[PDB]
Amino acid sequence: YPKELTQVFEHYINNNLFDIDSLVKFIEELGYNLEDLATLCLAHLLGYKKLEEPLKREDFLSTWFMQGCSTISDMQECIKTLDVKLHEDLQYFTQIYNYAFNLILDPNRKDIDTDEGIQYWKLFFQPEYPVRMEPDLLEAWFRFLRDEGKTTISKDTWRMLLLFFKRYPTIQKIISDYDETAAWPFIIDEFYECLQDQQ
Amino acid sequence: NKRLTEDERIEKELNTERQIFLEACIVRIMKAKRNLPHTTLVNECIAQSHQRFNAKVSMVKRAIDSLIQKGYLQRGDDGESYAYLA
């Protein structure tokens, strides 16, 4: 590994570990925040399985070296590139969306807390991203979850919601087409029957 | 304190007994078929449950969701089939 590259690792490490504080310092130096979607891209690239798990020196070095980066400017440019791709490329976006669940899931849990999910959903499902949907539907979904006491979200539901919004952009394409006997998660059937109530 | 009305406790028992029955029915089918389209599983589960009671699709889907959560079933890549997991 180029000396330059190893020096980046050494610079951000906290007492022998590239830990969550190392990561925060690192991405902030690049211009981002821990909660950004771009951070998910970074983590996915570096092979993180859990946000709070330390990154091994070898994984840091090999990944960057493989991507042809040896300096902090190289690294900044690489993440800019992935960020643009998240906005533009539906396949990568989907990949990052699916990856997000496990990355933010507490290692000791099976489901995530609804608040955390909404936090990321608010970012993922904006119109600047490849999945185009009406803001009302998204907010209705959040309200459904809050009103009906849905306090955790499973991986199957997390994963299927993407498909759901892919096929159903409006509160009204759903009325026109939604079939509650199909294979959608039952939580989405419940959302469907709240949506028809309202109109 | 009291979470539940008396009528609510009875409704809860009823549902639990239906769900427990449908969960075992579904596991039986999938253990033998291994892989199945959603439509075919739901239909089969209702037909095999008919002996006992009239299973509604919504009940079957709840049962399916529980078996996924418990790690008995994996949704297929097409998003509308299931695979049995031993």
CA-wise closest residue to A159 among A99, A119, A103, A115: A99
Question: Residue with structure tokens 């889907």?
Answer: B61
Give chain B's largest Cα–Cα span. 47
- Burial classification of residue B86, based on how many CB atoms lie within 10 Å of its CB (0-12 exposed, 13-18 middle, 19 or more buried): exposed
Domain residue extents for chain B = 1-86
The number of CA neighbours under 13 Å toward the Cβ of A23 is 22
- Show the CA angle centred on residue B82, arms to residues A119 and B14, nearest 5°: 80
* Token digits of residue B53: 């009671």
Residue A38 contacts residue A47 (beta carbons within 8 Å): no
Query: How many residues make up chain B in this entry?
Result: 86
- Show the CA angle centred on residue B19, arms to residues A113 and B57, nearest 5°: 90
The dihedral region occupied by A25, where left means phi > 0, alpha psi between -120 and 50, and beta the remainder, is alpha
Residue B57 contacts residue A186 (beta carbons within 8 Å): no
- Burial classification of residue B2, based on how many CB atoms lie within 10 Å of its CB (0-12 exposed, 13-18 middle, 19 or more buried): exposed
Residue A132 contacts residue A169 (beta carbons within 8 Å): yes
Which ranges of A19-106 does DSSP label H, i.e. alpha helix? Answer: 20-29, 37-46, 57-66, 72-88, 90-104
Domain residue extents for chain A = 1-108, 109-199
In whole angstroms, how far apart are CA A151 and each of A35, A67, A117, A187, B49?
21, 40, 10, 12, 32
CA-wise closest residue to A82 among A63, A102, A109, A107: A63
- Chain A with chain B: Cβ pairs closer than 8 A: 32
User: For an interface test with A, which of B65, B66, B70, B78 has the most A Cβ atoms less than 10 Å from its Cβ?
Assistant: B65
Contacts of A35 (CB under 8 A, 6+ apart): A119
Main-chain dihedrals φ then ψ at residue A55, nearest 5 degrees:
-90, 130
- Burial classification of residue A136, based on how many CB atoms lie within 10 Å of its CB (0-12 exposed, 13-18 middle, 19 or more buried): exposed
Question: Residue with structure tokens 């936090």?
Answer: A119
Coil/strand/helix, residue A68: coil
Question: Residue with structure tokens 């809050």?
Answer: A146
Look at the alpha carbons of A111, A117, A120, A125 in this order and tell me if their dihedral is positive or negative: positive
Method: X-ray
Query: How many residues make up chain A in this entry?
Result: 199
CA-based nearest distance B37→chain A, Å: 9
What is the enclosing helix (H) or strand (E) of B74? strand B73-75
Question: Residue with structure tokens 């028809």?
Answer: A196
Helix%, strand%, coil% for chain B, nearest 5: 60, 10, 25
Domains A1-108 and A109-199 share a fold: yes
Between positions 13 and 42 of B, the ones with CB within 8 A of A are: 38-39, 42
The amino acid at residue B22 is L
Residue B29 contacts residue B41 (beta carbons within 8 Å): yes
- Show the CA angle centred on residue B79, arms to residues B74 and B81, nearest 5°: 60
The class level of CATH for B1-86 reads mainly alpha
The amino acid at residue A96 is I
Between positions 45 and 64 of B, the ones with CB within 8 A of A are: 57-58, 61-62, 64
Strand partners, A17: A14
In this complex, do A189 and B58 lie within 8 Å of one another by their Cβ atoms?
A: yes
- Show the CA angle centred on residue B37, arms to residues B75 and A177, nearest 5°: 90
* Token digits of residue B28: 């039986």
In this complex, do B75 and A180 lie within 8 Å of one another by their Cβ atoms?
A: no
Q: For the residues of A105-161, what is the DSSP string, one character each?
A: S-TT-SSEEHHHHHHHHHHHTSTTSSS---HHHHHHHHHHHHHTT--EE-HHHHHHH
Topology of the domain comprising A1-108: Recoverin; domain 1 (1.10.238)
What's the CATH architecture for A109-199? Orthogonal Bundle (1.10)
In this complex, do A186 and B62 lie within 8 Å of one another by their Cβ atoms?
A: yes
Residue of B nearest to A162 (CA): B79
Contacts of A175 (CB under 8 A, 6+ apart): A195, A196, A199
Look at the alpha carbons of B20, B26, B31, B34 in this order and tell me if their dihedral is positive or negative: negative
The amino acid at residue A15 is N
In this complex, do A185 and B42 lie within 8 Å of one another by their Cβ atoms?
A: no
Q: Which of A159, A181, A185 sits opposite B65 (nearest CB)?
A: A185
Q: What is the DSSP letter of A54?
A: P
In this complex, do A180 and B68 lie within 8 Å of one another by their Cβ atoms?
A: no
What is the enclosing helix (H) or strand (E) of B57? helix B57-69
Residue A168 contacts residue A174 (beta carbons within 8 Å): yes
In this complex, do A110 and B79 lie within 8 Å of one another by their Cβ atoms?
A: no
User: For an interface test with B, which of A181, A189, A192 has the most B Cβ atoms less than 10 Å from its Cβ?
Assistant: A181
The amino acid at residue B1 is N
What is the Cα–Cα distance from A46 to A62, expressed in whole angstroms? 9
Q: Which of B38, B65, B75 sits opposite A182 (nearest CB)?
A: B38
The dihedral region occupied by B18, where left means phi > 0, alpha psi between -120 and 50, and beta the remainder, is alpha
Contacts of A168 in chain B (CB under 8 A): none
Contacts of A181 in chain B (CB under 8 A): 42, 57
CA-wise closest residue to B82 among B56, B59, B60: B60
